[PDB]
């Protein structure tokens, strides 16, 4: 019993973190096989970030301008290239600690673990969600750029995120490991606002099922509802629309608990319209939306 926001064990990723320096700028890189991946704004001064021409800044750099240090040892850089918003630094030594791995581009609402790093050194690990507006609400102090997000499937690490930017609102933006930003953000220090931060409905439902499984049942009511009727309520409260695909993903949790998905939607509707009346669910006074249905099953199993 008990329900906690758990991150994946970080060891496989710790062994890939390196330090990358170019001129006066230092951040984190990811060393896999003989390639080091890092945010391209490693080549920018604090002044260049207003309006960088990355292609022009990059021509002024040669292989020997990129310093790459794994722990207390220097890697030799034998090639460099820019792929979208990431730099790929070819080194002459394959990382002996490279796990089995994949690069994946995740969908909004999916969760992953972040290994927050500074100067190539692991600081902490936490679990979060890609928001529907493609931001993450993270913990990134100066220097944590290049820290990565991942999921682990048995022995294979699926890297899905690299931290690049803090937006003026305090939320974080970054890319997949091919260097494509999640959402409309760009690697420039300019006014970019996030759209509306909606709640991930299918995750709240999964978390409500977790609550039932762990004994918190007070919020279950005697009503049911329909998809269209619930979705009118969802729209009002800035919740993501619920689809039949989402109902299907919740199937195993419905089966485990014997609570129909639409019954749970009607419980959720009443919590949205009534609040919690000073009560809690799984120790929380708010509706939690950073557990996917797969997470809940994983943690309960």
Residues with a catalytic annotation lie at: 41, 145
Is the CA virtual torsion 271, 276, 280, 286 positive or negative? positive
State the DSSP code for 24: T
The token duo for 204 is 């709240």
Q: Is 127:118 a contact under the CB 8 Å cutoff?
A: no
Contacts of 5 (CB under 8 A, 6+ apart): 126, 127, 290, 291
Q: How far is the CB of 156 from Au ion (least distance, A)?
A: 3
Q: Is 193 in the site for a second copy (CB under 8 A)?
A: no
Residue closer to a second copy by CB (options 241, 275) is 275
Q: Is 123 in the site for a second copy (CB under 8 A)?
A: yes
Q: In what order do the strands lie in the sheet with 25-32?
A: 73-75, 66-70, 17-22, 25-32, 35-39, 86-91, 77-83
6-14, 103-111, 123-131, 151-159 -> range binding Au ion (CB under 5 A): 151-159
Residue closer to a second copy by CB (options 133, 139) is 139
Residue closer to a second copy by CB (options 136, 265) is 136
Cα separation, 30 vs 15, whole angstroms: 9
Q: Is 79 in the site for a second copy (CB under 8 A)?
A: no
User: Could you tell which of a second copy, Au ion, none binds residue 230, using a CB distance below 5 to 8 A set by kind?
Assistant: none
Footprint on residues 154-173 left by a second copy (CB under 8 A): 166, 170-172
Q: H/E element holding 130? A: none
Q: Is 232 in the site for Au ion (CB under 5 A)?
A: no
User: Could you tell which of Au ion, a second copy, none binds residue 145, using a CB distance below 5 to 8 A set by kind?
Assistant: Au ion
Footprint on residues 200-219 left by a second copy (CB under 8 A): 214-215
> Among 8, 54, 237, 294, which residue sits at the site for a second copy (rule: CB under 8 A)?
8
Q: Is 97:33 a contact under the CB 8 Å cutoff?
A: no
Cα separation, 115 vs 236, whole angstroms: 35
What track of x and - describes contact with a second copy for positions 244 through 263 (by CB under 8 A)?
--------------------
Q: Is 101 in the site for a second copy (CB under 8 A)?
A: no
The pairing of strands 100-103 and 156-166 is parallel
Interface ranges with a second copy (CB under 8 A):
1-12, 14-15, 115-116, 122-126, 128, 137-141, 166, 170-172, 214-215, 275, 278, 280, 283-286, 299-301
């Amino acid at each position: 019993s008990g329900f906690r926001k758990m991150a994946f064990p970080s060891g496989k990723v710790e062994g890939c973190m390196v330090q990358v320096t170019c001129g006066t700028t230092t951040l984190n890189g990811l060393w896999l096989d003989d390639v080091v991946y890092c945010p391209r704004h490693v080549i920018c001064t604090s002044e260049d970030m207003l309006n960088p021409n990355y292609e022009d800044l990059l021509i002024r750099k040669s292989n020997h301008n990129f310093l790459v240090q794994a722990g207390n040892v220097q890697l030799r850089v034998i090639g460099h290239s820019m792929q979208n918003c990431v730099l790929k630094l070819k080194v002459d030594t394959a990382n002996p600690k490279t796990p089995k791995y994949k690069f994946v581009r995740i969908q909004p609402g999916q969760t992953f673990s972040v290994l927050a790093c500074y100067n190539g050194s692991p600081s902490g690990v936490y679990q979060c969600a890609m928001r529907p507006n493609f931001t993450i609400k993270g913990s990134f102090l100066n220097g944590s750029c290049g820290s990565v997000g991942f999921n682990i499937d048995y022995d294979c690490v699926s890297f899905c995120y690299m931290h690049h930017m803090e937006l003026p609102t305090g939320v974080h933006a970054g890319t997949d490991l091919e260097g494509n930003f999640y959402g409309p953000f760009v690697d420039r220090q300019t006014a970019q606002a996030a759209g509306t931060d909606t709640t991930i409905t299918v995750n709240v439902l999964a978390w409500l099922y977790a609550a039932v499984i762990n004994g918190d049942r007070w919020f279950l009511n005697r009503f049911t509802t329909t998809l269209n009727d619930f979705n009118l309520v969802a729209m009002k409260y800035n919740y993501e629309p619920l689809t039949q695909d989402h109902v299907d993903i919740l199937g195993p949790l419905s089966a485990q608990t014997g609570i129909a998905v639409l019954d749970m939607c009607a419980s959720l509707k009443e919590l949205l319209q009534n609040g919690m009346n000073g009560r809690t669910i799984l120790g929380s006074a708010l509706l939690e939306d950073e557990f996917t249905p797969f997470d809940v099953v994983r943690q309960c199993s």
